[PDB]
């Protein structure tokens, strides 16, 4: 598997000295997290970049777009986190283009809803996480973790997330392995196994909460992108019908 081009379509997120990460699914929408855009921020104040490389670093094959209007789900819960989902709905140039599709820059593909997930289903989850503030120098590369699905019996056990898990939240990561706490951003991708799908690799997850970086790992919490794929494929439909 490819290492600079490794994640073509994950989006960096900016506002004010905020930060997101996010899923390109098609060339002119985002897929992130409802967490992310709770305050409302006026669409003006965003800025996508897909292709980068390290947070906040211009680089050749970066492109920056504007957001023209997005979209929470309409049942989100900023208490609970359930229903944690957006679309970023970018601004189309003087071309009617948004993403200039690149060998840094691709579109990943929704799931099927055919594949059930399962504990042998493999993942990974891409994102920058955890870095020093100051000294711009240093900032941290994309990484990314293999993961397992992780079952909801075993994550909603009292010793894990207990009664947090919710439908439309899945879980992933090992219960005392560690490492992806430090290393996802709110909003980022998790890409699993479909086979039952055109493409290898679907995007499953969206980096939704689990726990804090520095505390001891759990599983993180992921919104099940699976159990909203109707949802999705409504609110970007190219014809009304």
Not at 62 to 81: D, G, K, M, N, W
Not at 197 to 208: K, P
Not at 217 to 226: F, H, I, L, R, S
Request: one cysteine or more; hydrophobic letters at 35%; aromatic letters at 8%.
């Amino acid at each position: 598997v490819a290492l600079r081009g490794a994640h073509p379509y994950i989006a960096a997120l900016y506002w004010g000295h905020s930060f997101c990460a996010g899923s390109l699914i098609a060339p002119c929408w985002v897929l992130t997290a409802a967490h992310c855009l709770q305050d409302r921020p006026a669409p003006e104040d965003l800025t996508v970049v897909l292709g980068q490389e390290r947070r906040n670093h211009s680089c050749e094959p970066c492109q920056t777009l504007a957001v023209r209007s997005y979209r929470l789900h309409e049942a989100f819960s900023p208490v609970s986190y359930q229903h944690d989902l957006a679309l970023l709905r970018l601004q189309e140039d003087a071309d009617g283009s948004c993403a200039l599709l690149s060998p840094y820059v691709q579109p990943v593909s929704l799931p099927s809803g055919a594949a059930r997930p399962s504990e042998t289903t493999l993942c990974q989850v891409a994102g920058w996480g955890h870095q020093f503030e100051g000294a711009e120098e240093y900032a941290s590369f994309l990484q990314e973790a293999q993961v397992p699905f992780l079952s909801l019996e075993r994550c909603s056990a009292p010793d894990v997330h207990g009664s947090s898990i919710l439908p439309g939240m899945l879980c992933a990561g090992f219960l005392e392995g560690g490492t992806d706490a430090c290393q996802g951003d709110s909003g980022g991708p998790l890409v699993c196994e479909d086979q039952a799908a055109e493409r290898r690799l679907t995007l499953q997850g969206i980096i939704s909460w689990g726990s804090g970086c520095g505390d001891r790992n759990k599983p993180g919490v992921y919104t099940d992108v699976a159990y909203y794929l109707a949802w999705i494929r409504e609110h970007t439909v190219s014809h009304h019908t």
